[PDB]
Structure 1
Amino acid sequence: AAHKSFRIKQKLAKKLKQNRSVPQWVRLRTGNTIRYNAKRRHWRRTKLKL
Structure 2
Amino acid sequence: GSIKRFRLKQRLGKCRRQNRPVPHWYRLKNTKRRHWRRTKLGL
* TM bin (shorter chain): 0.7 to 0.9
Identity score, percent: 58
- For these two proteins, the number of residue pairs brought into alignment is 43
Q: TM-score, normalised by structure 1?
A: 0.69
Show CA shifts across 1:6-48 (max 9, x none): 111111110011111111110122xxxxxx241x122122111
Moved over 3 A (4+): none
Q: Per residue, is there more helix in 1 or in 2?
A: 2
CA RMSD of aligned residues (A): 1.3
Unaligned 5+ runs, structure 1: 30-35
